[PDB]
Amino acid sequence: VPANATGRALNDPREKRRLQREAER
Amino acid sequence: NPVTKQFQFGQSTVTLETGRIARQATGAVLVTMDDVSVLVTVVGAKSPAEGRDFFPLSVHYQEKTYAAGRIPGGFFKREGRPSEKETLTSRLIDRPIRPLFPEGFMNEVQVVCTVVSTNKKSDPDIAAMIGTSAALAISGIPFAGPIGAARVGFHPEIGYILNPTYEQLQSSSLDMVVAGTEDAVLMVESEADELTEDQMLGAVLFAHDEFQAVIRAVKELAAEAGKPAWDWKAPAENTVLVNAIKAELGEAISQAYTITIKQDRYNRLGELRDQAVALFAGEEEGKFPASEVKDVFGLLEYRTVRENIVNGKPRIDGRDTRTVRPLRIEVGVLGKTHGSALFTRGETQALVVATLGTARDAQLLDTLEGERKDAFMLHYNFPPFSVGECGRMGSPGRREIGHGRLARRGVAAMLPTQDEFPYTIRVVSEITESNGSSSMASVCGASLALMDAGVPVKAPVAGIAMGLVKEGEKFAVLTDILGDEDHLGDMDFKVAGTDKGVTALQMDIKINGITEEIMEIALGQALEARLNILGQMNQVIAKPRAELSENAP
Amino acid sequence: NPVTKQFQFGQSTVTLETGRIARQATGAVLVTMDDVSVLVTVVGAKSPAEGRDFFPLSVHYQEKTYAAGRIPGGFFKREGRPSEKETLTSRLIDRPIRPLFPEGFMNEVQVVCTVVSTNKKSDPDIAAMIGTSAALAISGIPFAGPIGAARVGFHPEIGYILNPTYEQLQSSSLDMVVAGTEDAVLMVESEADELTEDQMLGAVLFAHDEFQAVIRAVKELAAEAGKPAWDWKAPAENTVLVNAIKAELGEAISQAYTITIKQDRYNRLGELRDQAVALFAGEEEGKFPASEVKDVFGLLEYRTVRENIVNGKPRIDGRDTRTVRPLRIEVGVLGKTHGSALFTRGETQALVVATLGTARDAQLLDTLEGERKDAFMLHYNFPPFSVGECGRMGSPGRREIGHGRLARRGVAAMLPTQDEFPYTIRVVSEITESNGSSSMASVCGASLALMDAGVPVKAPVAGIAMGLVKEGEKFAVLTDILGDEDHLGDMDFKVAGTDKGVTALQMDIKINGITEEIMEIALGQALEARLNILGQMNQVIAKPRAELSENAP
Amino acid sequence: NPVTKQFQFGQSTVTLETGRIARQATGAVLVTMDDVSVLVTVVGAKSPAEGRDFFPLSVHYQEKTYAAGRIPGGFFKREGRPSEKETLTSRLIDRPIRPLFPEGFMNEVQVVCTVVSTNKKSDPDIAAMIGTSAALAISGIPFAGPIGAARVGFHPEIGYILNPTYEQLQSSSLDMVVAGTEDAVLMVESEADELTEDQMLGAVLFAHDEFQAVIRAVKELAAEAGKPAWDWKAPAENTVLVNAIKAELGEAISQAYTITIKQDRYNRLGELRDQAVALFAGEEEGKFPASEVKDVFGLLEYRTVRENIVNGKPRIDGRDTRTVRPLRIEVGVLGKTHGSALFTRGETQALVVATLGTARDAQLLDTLEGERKDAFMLHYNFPPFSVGECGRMGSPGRREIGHGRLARRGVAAMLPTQDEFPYTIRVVSEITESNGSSSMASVCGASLALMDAGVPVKAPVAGIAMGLVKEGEKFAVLTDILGDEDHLGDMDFKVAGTDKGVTALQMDIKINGITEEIMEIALGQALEARLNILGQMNQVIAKPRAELSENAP
């Protein structure tokens, strides 16, 4: 897919925060 | 004596050496990042000049060719007047630091960054920003906190890329430069390939989260090799005089900004200025100060306009916060030019002309990293008669070169590669009227003139310049910011793009407190404005002319 | 809404459009004439600068390469410093309009004439002058009458040609630009091929009759879409102080001006000026500023030296009104130059040197219409020591470029073509002394130097700077005006040419009272002077030397 | 009425002509010397400008291309910005004549030297200096005696050559320009091929003996055609105030100068200066006017330090007259540069970088005698941060061109030829700190960078800046003069060279009385200093690197 299609990157700080919010919870 | 500090910025080792070179400047640091060494110096005047009513800050980024192992090109074989990359870097370093000097500071300051060594593999400017931060930290000059900077890229597979090299930036869909302090982002200049607003805000938050290493290392450097802090005391406020004009002749300020006609509003206000200066000219006890009472009134005007905007009142021109000024769009306005467009947004007007040529008309950019051929040139002109004033009609200054790069940044993603279109292109945007962001009118005019000349651009691109006024916990986002409002806002951004995604983003924050959600709301309002403008543009010309111009090679 | 006015200038449909482009300048007009479109904007400041004692008027004529659908040349690929053509055209537009602004107007006025499109067949300067007149008529700024301009060529078969194209100019024997109002002519800039004075006068009256259409169209456009006139107060004259100094001190100034020694007169008139700034400089703790007294003194002096010139008395130097100053001519002054000449007329001296080169030494002119090669260059240098002052040494100014172009116009008719003389000729005229018209001593010196080098010029050329003072119904023509008599005159005409015809004519009228008979008497006296100076020139060198100098290139 | 004076300057006939050309300048002379004709004009302002505290003297040396019979190269085919040779001649004419105007003379003076003819076989600068001397002698402007100038070359068999031609300078081992007066020598600008100090002083004495003819001829020309001498009366010294301040604060300012801490000194002195201003100044009758006392206090400081230097007491910084400030030498300070060095001498630092290129990178000089390719260039940069100040960051000024030609002269003798090293060398000396002679730290950094890069330079070369304070019959030679001490001295010289001989010598004597013995003692102390600096330098890098830098071509 093009760049515009791709979603939130894995190093995106907000994605990391959501991930740690799921692992912690 | 040489105090060297080493830290890890990403995967790159940065070396900040002080004490050895330039020991007579107020601050001087040698920054070595990825085999790129830059010597940054900061000299601050020890006394304020008599009559100095403005802060004289100067930033001079210089790229010496010996850093690349080359002898300068040209007839004189010496480096000369700043190139365009050195003027853009000078303004990229100048923009973040100026808001951070304390209010009332009027001593002259001159930052001079000199690239002295380079491997030619990475841009030498994030090292000049790190060096400016470290020099202003070890100097002692009144400055607010260490700043940091970082360039971000984006490749769909890898994700965001910190401090991308010149080879990493050839396959990336973003080229963003974010600068900020430990708790706020202060500057964003980016270019992109139709990336969503989410992807362009995640980059700003990635860069903000990444250059905190620079701030920590400049705080340790300042706490180790720092000069004693200057004994400069911020002047106190005329609380009394302010709390006075506020009532004595303040309700008339409220009833003078409810006029949308510039003449009437200006006259009625000016009459108030005189009425109130006389009523309490200077502090009351002696009534001696003159400009004091005129500028305490100017502060009650700034606060009044902002309070009204935030409280949900009609703007100075009667519009609401989400209204774009009326647009008049014309294509084909000049008979014998390859492409032409007259774009009017209210009282802002840009006459953009696109010309096509052959490979012999391409510009030879003698860069530090070598020699390139630029087959696209956008030249933004801002003649003083656009603001109804007389002035110098000379060479482009820093403001025109930066406003031409913002427009080029907005339009670049749509332009055809040399394989698709084997011709040089020179867009020339002349600002005939200005009461707002004329750079975004240059982006719209460029799109129109290029689709009128026949250039196979991918899609129509439009730009919008906006602002944000935050007063405590209440904030208001202003669409299509005016010229008067440009200095009245807390964050003024400028978003260009197509109907799919952003192709350029410039932001210049001045306050602390603009969270992520505020930026998402502002960028959504910018998207709706841009889509409105783009839809009105498609009613004139929607696609590149079927056949090339009648006068083009 | 855009008001558009269309009229017929001779055979060309001329369109003036206002209200669409540049609606933030005091006046703006887009002029389309013969597929040439020029945007002209005038901005006048609302209030004059504090302490300003001169009227700042600035005209900037710019040719944009995209008008021709071309990309600029040069390393930077952008329009930078104005070319010689742009400088000359801005001066040409400036000359006719400065005397029209009322006396006492100190507000800054800036005119900008940008060529936005062209078909490369006509000179865009006439359209620029039309746009200047229209914009000044719509601005509301105090201005005296609409001006009209026209270019005239000549052919022996067709007669006079109005606004000739480049192709017509190739065959034409005349290239004259005339500008004037409904009642008078105010500017003539001509380049002829040995045309009699009758033919030049007929061309000036042809142009005056022709551009009445321009004047009428501008008047109608100003009536339709003119901005309200400015409320400007013509300052009153201090007739009490005028009569006071012309009564008590009247005969003193006259006696002073009967002195012929310059230094004695200045010493005798500084004294009188101190006495005047004493007897009447106080009335109520000061009658009026020191400058005011010196201004009424200047004005009275002026009035008296013009009453003396008109009444028949000797001139400031003792000469009659038909005397050419004593001439000293020399050739071969410099040993190693290809050709040299020292021409002295009174206190005006010019050292002119002619050099020969090959076809590689021709100047590559980048013209809006293409790329030409100049095989003749005339450079005029006016150093401050020619007048005995310490000035600045640097790039040639407006006046040096204009004077050099006038000398080139006065000599170009005699230059051989490349077929007979396949060499490049560069003439440099250094003005070593100036107390008159240096440009016409540069024409005489260029003729002498070219003959000395061996260049096969057709015939000798000489020039004479003339003047006319007209008080009421009486007038006097002054031959070989001095540097002090330049501002005293009402018309300043400079005629160059050979003994058979006129090669160049430049007129600058300021009063609305000069008829055709006065210009025939003026051109007859100018002929007598030019033929006396040619008689004296032919005694030194009469024809080019049989052999070229020691070094051909 | 031309006046012509012929005289013999060696075996050349010099012709001075006055009265024919430039008769409105204060003084104008045409000098013809060996088929080189130069017109030199001097103009002096009649009245000093109000609010003028410094003496404005400017010299402008111009080489006109038509003198050589050539059309100038370039796009504009016209002489434009001054070349390096022109700026260097201007400063060479400016050095000997600035100190000769009476101190307190504030009228503006402008000298213009135009080269109008040449046979391309000798340098016109000597003729320019002769013309300057003659014009200043004829002008009448207060000027302390006619000067003379001469160029000296040296050959082992011929001996000394007076005014060598361009051909005689190819086989010569010296290129000295000595300027002086009948009883003193005021300027020496030399470049030698490792000549002994005896052979370098014997040439300044041969030169002083040989140009006395110029002074005699100028005296006769002035006693025959000189204008009356201006009635300029020097402002008498305020012996009263001087005596009172000397008595009250002699020990005060004495002690103030016996402290080496820089800031402490400034403090203590400002306190004694503000105390001195408080008394004896003000508006009350008897209080001396305004800053006159303040400037008398400055003078009282000057006399103090000088009397301290000649009495054998320690210098301002604490050093003796024979100590060279601590040197910190480093080579290879930058990674990607071909050669680099950091030379610190106390508070004078230089970052010298050497870069190697190819034949295409050689500079094209369009000299008056033709076109020459330069395969060695040295560019000296003096940024304002070097001194802790803020200031313009643009083109190199006269000061930088002259200091870089002095460092070039110092290092020129050791460079290889295009047969032993077929490369182009560019040396850029960045003055990162300045508190002394930066040009000699640039000579030492140039040597160290050229050997760090692998250039086969013949031997190490170092330079020392010296001074001499003569207080009556006692004198004191100061080694490694500081920036503060630069103005106190009565003779500042700069001796570059290796351990075998002198390679450059610049003297600027300012008084009369320096005999040959004082110039033998001074150069024998500068030999000791230079040999100490060479000894310290050789402990870092002695010989050129084994092989050309790996990154270099």
Author numbering:
A (entry chain D): 983 to 1007
B (entry chain A), C (entry chain B), D (entry chain C): 2 to 554
The study reports:
In Escherichia coli and numerous other bacteria, two of the principal enzymes mediating messenger RNA decay and RNA processing—RNase E, an endoribonuclease, and polynucleotide phosphorylase (PNPase), an exoribonuclease—assemble into a multi-enzyme complex known as the RNA degradosome. Notwithstanding, PNPase predominantly acts as phosphorolytic 3′ → 5′ exoribonuclease that catalyses the processive degradation of single-stranded RNA, involved both in mRNA decay and sRNA-mediated gene regulation.
To structurally investigate the interaction, the complex between the PNPase core and an MBP-tagged version of the C-terminal end of RNase E (883 – 1057) from P. aeruginosa was assembled and analysed by cryo-EM. The map reveals a new mode of interaction between the two ribonucleases, where a region of the intrinsically disordered part of RNase E from residues 948–964 interacts with the RNase PH domain of PNPase by the formation of an α-helix. The interaction is mediated by charged residues forming hydrogen bonds and salt bridges. Residues of the α-helix form several interactions with the backbone of the PNPase protomer, and one example is shown in the right panel of Fig. 4E. Moreover, two Arg residues form several salt bridges with negatively charged residues on the PNPase. Although the interacting area is smaller compared to what was found for E. coli and S. enterica, the number of interactions provides sufficient stability to be visualized by cryo-EM.
